[PDB]
Structure 1
Amino acid sequence: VLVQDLLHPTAASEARKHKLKTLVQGPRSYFLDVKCPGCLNITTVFSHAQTAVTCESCSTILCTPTGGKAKLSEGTSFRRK
C-alpha cells in the first residue's frame, strides 16, 4: 500500500503489535484487586507478579509466579483495577 494514515492506526492493528512497536509504547499489563477467602482485605496485585504475593491478614497466597502472567489461586475473586 502506498497511502496510509500512520498517525491514526486502527485499534485492532495496534492491538496486534508488540508493546514496543506501537506508535507510543505502553504496557499491556495491569493491576488487579484480589480478595482472599474469609477476611475481606482487598489487596492490589500486579498481573505479571514474579512474587508469591500474600494478604497481610493470613498466609492465603494469592498468586504464584510463572513465565508470564501470575496464576491466581483458586478461591479468589479478582477485579481488573
Structure 2
Amino acid sequence: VLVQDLLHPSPATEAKQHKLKTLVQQPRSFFMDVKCQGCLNITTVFSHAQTAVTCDSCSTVLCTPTGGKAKLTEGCSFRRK
C-alpha cells in the first residue's frame, strides 16, 4: 500500500494493535465497581489487580490476581467505570 492515512487508522485495526503500538499509547485496563453478593457497597477495583482485594464492609476477597486480568470471585458483579 503506497498511499494510506496514517493519521486516521481504521478503528477496527486500531483496536487490534498492541497498547504501545497505537498512534498515542493508551492502557487497555480499566477500573470496576464491584458488588459483593453479601451487601451493596461500591468498591473500586483495578481490572488487572495484583492484590486480593477485600471490601471494607465484610472481609471477603473480591478478586484473585492472575497473570493478566484479576479474576472476580463467585457472586461478585462488576461494572466498568
TM-score calculated relative to the size of structure 2? 0.96
Q: Which amino acid aligns with 2:73?
A: S
Hey, what does 1:59 align to over in structure 2? 59
User: How far did residue 69 of structure 1 move?
Assistant: 0.3
Q: Distance in 2 between matches of 1:51 and 1:26?
A: 23
| Runs of 5+ consecutive residues of structure 1 not aligned to the other structure | none
The count of corresponding residues between Structure 1 and Structure 2 is 81
TM-score calculated relative to the size of structure 1? 0.96
Hey, what does 1:78 align to over in structure 2? 78
Q: Distance in 2 between matches of 1:15 and 1:29?
A: 13
Hey, what does 2:28 align to over in structure 1? 28
| Runs of 5+ consecutive residues of structure 2 not aligned to the other structure | none
Q: Cα deviation per residue 1:50-71 (whole Å; 9 max; x = unaligned)?
A: 0000000111110000010000
Q: Distance in 2 between matches of 1:74 and 1:3?
A: 51
CA RMSD for the aligned pairs?
0.7
SS of residue in 2 equivalent to 1:27: coil
The ranges of structure 1 where at least 4 consecutive aligned residues each deviate by more than 6 angstroms after the TM superposition are none
Q: Distance in 1 between matches of 2:37 and 2:50?
A: 22
